[PDB]
Write a protein that binds this ligand. Structure first.
Ligand SMILES: [Cl-]
Ligand SMILES: [Mg+2]
Length: 288
């Protein structure tokens, strides 16, 4: 499966498009990266041609820039994928090309502690990874924290419970067991509606971050930087934390592996992340 189709299942054709796509925003895990957390050669080959044609490709991830650099560092070192500008921590940390934070949305400290106390009260504090600007922290290590470290490719430093109060954080990620994902998700959303964003971003990850921030806020700021109209931008993703940027832009692609809620928010449905998604996006929308 290597096609991109609209809501009616009709293939998108370049000659039918009246908008030049100048910039592509793409999620990392589950979108650009395959199940092996690698950039396929087909994708890599298309990204090279994109640079040649001056098409900007921007990462839009819940990850920090640091963990991203650890996963695709080889591609960054060869200047084949730029991390700046980039949208990180679900928009809460969005950088321009100068590494300046055009969005810097820290979590309120009272809310931080309330989330923390709540997590301990329901015993998911052990699964919590707290994100500062430069470092991540946890309170213990278990099979679920282990599972997080392996995929994230950047280990949190272990700290005591009392230390969280002194930290300035942007988000918390709960690497939960699959057997308490659904219920824990209800409790967080019930407890913290109109207080903080709650999203099941990847596998059994539950991320909490600034209520009025998301990836699409990052998209708007970066498009504004380069004087690019949103109509000349394209977003692609697979997760709940991509919904805002997929529905916010006229041109957006939900990869096949995405859920139905995610696909419905996107303008188009494309190949899975294991099927060289961005390669085909670049073909259809930018003519290679
Ligand atoms: Cl993500
Ligand atoms: Mg994803």
């Amino acid at each position: 499966m290597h096609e991109i189709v609209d809501k009616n299942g009709k293939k998108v054709q370049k000659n039918n498009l009246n908008d030049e796509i100048k910039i592509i925003f793409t999620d990392l895990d589950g979108t650009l990266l395959n199940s092996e957390n690698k950039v396929s050669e087909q994708n890599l080959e298309s990204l090279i041609r994109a640079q040649e044609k001056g098409i900007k490709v921007v990462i839009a991830t819940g990850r920090s820039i640091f963990s991203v650099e650890n996963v695709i560092g080889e591609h960054v070192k060869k200047n084949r994928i730029s991390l700046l500008p980039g949208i990180y921590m679900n928009g809460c940390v969005t950088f321009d090309e100068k590494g300046s934070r055009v969005i810097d949305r820290i979590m309120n400290n009272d809310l931080k502690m309330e989330i923390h106390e709540f997590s301990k009260q329901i015993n998911i504090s052990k699964y919590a990874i707290w994100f500062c600007l430069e470092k991540t922290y946890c309170f213990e290590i278990n099979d679920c924290i282990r599972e997080y470290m392996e995929v994230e490719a950047l280990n949190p430093d272990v700290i005591e419970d009392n230390m969280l109060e002194g930290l300035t954080v942007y988000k918390v990620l709960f690497s939960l067991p699959e057997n308490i994902l659904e219920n824990t998700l209800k409790l967080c959303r019930e407890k913290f509606s109109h207080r903080i964003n709650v999203a099941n971003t990847f596998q059994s990850y539950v991320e909490l971050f600034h209520q009025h921030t998301n990836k699409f806020e990052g998209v708007k700021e970066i498009c504004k930087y380069y004087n690019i109209s949103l109509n000349n931008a394209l977003a692609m993703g697979d997760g709940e934390n991509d919904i805002e940027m997929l529905s916010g832009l006229t041109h957006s692609v939900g990869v096949h592996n995405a859920s139905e809620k995610v696909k419905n928010s996107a303008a188009y449905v494309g190949p899975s992340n294991n099927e060289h998604a961005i390669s085909h996006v670049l073909k259809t929308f930018c003519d290679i």
